[PDB]
Structure 1
Amino acid sequence: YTDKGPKPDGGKFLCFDHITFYVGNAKQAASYYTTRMGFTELAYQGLETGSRKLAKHVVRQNKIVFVFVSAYEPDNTELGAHLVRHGDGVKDVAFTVEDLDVIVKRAKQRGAEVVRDIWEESDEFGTVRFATVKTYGDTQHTFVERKNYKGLFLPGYKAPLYDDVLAKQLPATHLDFIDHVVGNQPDLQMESVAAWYEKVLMFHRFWSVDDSQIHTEYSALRSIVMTNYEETVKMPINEPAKGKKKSQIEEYVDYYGGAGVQHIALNTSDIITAIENLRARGMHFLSVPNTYYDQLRERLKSSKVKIQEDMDTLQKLNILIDYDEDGYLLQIFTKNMQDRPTLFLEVIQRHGHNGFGAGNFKALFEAIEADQDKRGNL
C-alpha cells in the first residue's frame, strides 16, 4: 500500500514481452545466449522466410524472450550506425499491453517520439497489434497487444531451420521471467528520463528499501525505479554520482556512446541450481572474496531473517545476499556480454524483499577494496 499516483484511465502494461538486441552477427549472438545462458532458439525470420533486409533469431527461456537482429545488406544506415556507435546492445524493450490504443494516444499527446504508429500483422494463427515509441538514447519501446496469440512468438515468424544438439545437451538454467531492466543515463539526465516515464506512460516511482538508505558513496550512482500502475514492469534509471571511486555509469556511457540498457535481471526460483548450471555452460560471474561472506555471516548474527539456501553453497558459487528484517534476496552478476564494458546480466531470487541489492555496493566495495589496498593497488 504506497502512493502509486493517479490511476490511468485505460490501458494496462501486463509484463515484459521481449527484448530486441541489434547485433553484428545475430546467428552467433543467438548461439551465445542459447549455449551460455540456457535459452532455446524458438523462431526465425530471414532470407528463407522472405525477410530480405533483416535476419531475426528469437530465443526463449520460460517467459523470457530475446530477439537478435542483424542487417543483410551493406550500408544499412540505421542498424549500421547503431552497431558502430554502441557495439552489440539492447534496441527495444517491449511490453505486453491491453488497450494499446489508449496507451499510444496518451503517449503521443504527451510528447512521445513515434517510431511507428499503430499497425497490425496477421498469419494463420491470429493477429497482433503494435506501436513503437522512442525512450532514452537509441532505445525504444514496442507495445505488443497479443490477444492470447496462438502462433509461434509473433505473426510472420517461422520455425528455425535446424535444431541445435549443443544447446539441447546442456542442463536447464531455471530462469523464469524478466525482473527488471536498468537504463544508464549520462550526467544529470536521470530526473528528466524518470519524468518521461511518469508523464508519457503514466508510470510512477517505485519506492523500496534501497531508496530509504543512501549508498552513493559506494555505488557512485543515483537511481530512480519507474513502474507501471500495477507494478508488473520495473524500469530503473541510473545516472552517475560522486563516490569514492570513478563511476561505472560514466564508463558505461563513455563506451556505449550514450544512454542505454546496463543490465537485464532474470528472476529464478532456484538460484543454486541456476548458477551451478550456468557455470557448467561456461558463464563467468563477479569474483567475491571470502571476507564478504565472513562479514555477511557476522551481520546476520543480529538479524531475525532466516536464509533458506545453504550458505556454504552460496559462498562456493559466489552468490550475493541482501536483506532487511522482513526478508532477503539472492543475486549474482554475470561478466560482460561483449568486450565493451557495457551490458551484463543479473540472476535474482526474491524471498519477501522488493529491493535491488543496493546493500551490496558497500559490502562488495569494502571487501574488494580492502584486499586490493593490502595488495598495494598493483
Structure 2
Amino acid sequence: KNPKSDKFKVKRFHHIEFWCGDATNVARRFSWGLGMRFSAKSDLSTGNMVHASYLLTSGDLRFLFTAPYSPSLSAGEIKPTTTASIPSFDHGSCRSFFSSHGLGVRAVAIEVEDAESAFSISVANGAIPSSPPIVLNEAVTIAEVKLYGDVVLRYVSYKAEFLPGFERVEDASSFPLDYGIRRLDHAVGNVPELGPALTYVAGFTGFHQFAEESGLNSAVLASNDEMVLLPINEPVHGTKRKSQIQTYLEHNEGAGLQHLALMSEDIFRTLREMRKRSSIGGFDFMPSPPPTYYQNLKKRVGDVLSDDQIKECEELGILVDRDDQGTLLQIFTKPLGDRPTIFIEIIQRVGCMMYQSGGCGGFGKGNFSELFKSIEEYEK
C-alpha cells in the first residue's frame, strides 16, 4: 500500500554532505576509493573565507565534504556579508558535530519543488527548524530541518551548477574516475527508539511506511514515488550478541546516519574496482560469507542468476536477497573512518520494471538469517 501522502513535492536525493576536520584529505580518499570525480569547489580560491567544500560526483551521486577554516579569516563578516556558499554553515556547529560524532553525514539533501514551502509545511507539521530558507543568487533555495541526532534533512529547490558560489573544478584536477556508481538508493539512520523517530519524520514529511533477533528493529519511510528511501533502525537489547546499532550509538555519541547505499549500474565492475584499491587508499569490505552461502544461492535465486553470475558473486563477496517483486545484490564496507559508526553499502537491483520502481528487492534483511545459517552450515 502506498497512500502517496507527501505533504510537499519531493523529487530525488540531491546530495550527501560530510562534516570533516580536513575536507581535502577525506575527499581525496573517497574519490579514489569510490571512483568519484572532483566536480566543484567552494574554498579560499573561490573567495570563501568560512568553509572549504569539495564536491565529488559519480553519475547522479553527489558527495560534499566540508570543513571549517579558522574563524579569524571571517571574523569581520556578518551573515548579511558572509562569504560562505552554504549559508547554514556555522564554525561552532561543525566543530561540535565533529568532536561529538567524528567523521560523518551532517546533511541528507533532497531536491524538492519549492524549498521554502517544504520548510514551512514541515515546521507546521512538527519539524524542528535547523536553518531557514535562504535564496542563493535568486536561483537556488536551501532550507534545513532536524532529521535525527545532529543530522539534518536539507531541502534544495532550483528555479531553472551545484550551488551558487561553487566553481567547476579545473579539468587537470578532475580525473574522470568511474567505477559504476550512479545514485543514492537509500540513507539509513540509527536511533535509540524507532517509534518516536518514525512518528516525527513521517509526521512532518508525509512519507509513508514502505512495504517490507539480529539486534535491530527497522522500518523504511518513502516518498510518493518511493525514490527517496529513509530506513531507520533501533537496537534490540539483551540479545547475547551485542546489537551493532547499540555499538553505533555508543561510539557515535547518539543517533546519526548509519549507512549510505549507493546504486551501481554494474555491481561486479564496481566491486572489482573497489577491491583492487582497498589496501592502497580505498575502502575495505566486511568479511565475505562462507562458500556454503553461495552453495545455497542456487535454491534461492537460481532463476535470476546463472551459475556463472552466482560464481562472480562468490568471487567478490556479494550478498543476494529477494523480495516478492525483485532481487537485491549488496555488499558492505567496513566503517569509513576511525569510529565503528558509518559505512557504505553498494547495491544493484533486478526486477520491478515498468524504469525500475524504488526499493525493488527490499533492503537485505533476509541476509541476517541466511548469513548466520551459512556460517553454522560451513562450521559443519
TM-score, normalised relative to structure 2: 0.86
Question: By how many angstroms is 1:147 displaced?
Answer: 3.0
Partner of 2:292: 291
Match of 1:73 among 57, 70, 74: 70
Question: By how many angstroms is 1:245 displaced?
Answer: 1.2
Partner of 2:114: 99
Contact 2:39–2:57 (CA<8 Å) still a contact in 1? yes
Partner of 1:211: none
Q: Does 1:33 align with 2:42?
A: no
Match of 1:180 among 178, 186, 190: 186
Question: By how many angstroms is 1:101 displaced?
Answer: 3.3
Q: Does 1:43 align with 2:49?
A: no
Question: By how many angstroms is 1:72 displaced?
Answer: 0.7
The 5 Å alignment of 1:222-261 reads 222-242=217-237, 243-261=239-257
> For residues 369 and 244 of structure 2, what CA distance do their matches in structure 1 show?
14
The 5 Å alignment of 1:3-42 reads 3-4=2-3, 6=5, 8=7, 11-42=8-39
Partner of 1:133: 145
SS at match of 1:310: helix
Q: Does 1:355 align with 2:334?
A: no
Question: By how many angstroms is 1:238 displaced?
Answer: 0.4
**1:154 corresponds to which letter in structure 2?**
L
TM-score, normalised relative to structure 1: 0.86
Q: Does 1:193 align with 2:197?
A: yes
Q: Deviations over 1:108-128 (max 9, x none)?
A: 112222222221112xxx711
Partner of 1:213: none
SS at match of 1:101: helix
SS at match of 2:296: helix
> Is 70-79 or 27-36 further displaced after alignment?
70-79
Question: CA separation of 1:304/1:198 partners in 2, compared to 1, >3 Å: closer, same or farther?
Answer: same
Contact 2:38–2:55 (CA<8 Å) still a contact in 1? yes
Partner of 1:334: 333
The number of aligned residues is 347
Q: Deviations over 1:290-340 (max 9, x none)?
A: 12112333x33xx67321571111100101111246431111111110121
Question: CA separation of 1:326/1:143 partners in 2, compared to 1, >3 Å: closer, same or farther?
Answer: closer
Match of 1:367 among 367, 374, 378: 374
> For residues 238 and 141 of structure 1, what CA distance do their matches in structure 2 show?
17
> For residues 270 and 201 of structure 2, what CA distance do their matches in structure 1 show?
33
Partner of 1:307: 305
> For residues 362 and 108 of structure 1, what CA distance do their matches in structure 2 show?
40
**2:286 corresponds to which letter in structure 1?**
L
The 5 Å alignment of 1:267-286 reads 267-282=263-278, 283-286=283-286
**1:108 corresponds to which letter in structure 2?**
V
Question: By how many angstroms is 1:244 displaced?
Answer: 4.7
Which structure 2 segments of 5+ residues have no match? 73-90, 352-359
**1:13 corresponds to which letter in structure 2?**
V
Question: By how many angstroms is 1:74 displaced?
Answer: 6.1
Question: By how many angstroms is 1:179 displaced?
Answer: 0.4
SS at match of 1:197: helix
Alpha-carbon RMSD: 2.1
Contact 2:297–2:310 (CA<8 Å) still a contact in 1? no
**2:287 corresponds to which letter in structure 1?**
S
Give the percent of matched residue pairs that are identical in Structure 1 and Structure 2.
Answer: 35
Contact 1:180–1:234 (CA<8 Å) still a contact in 2? yes
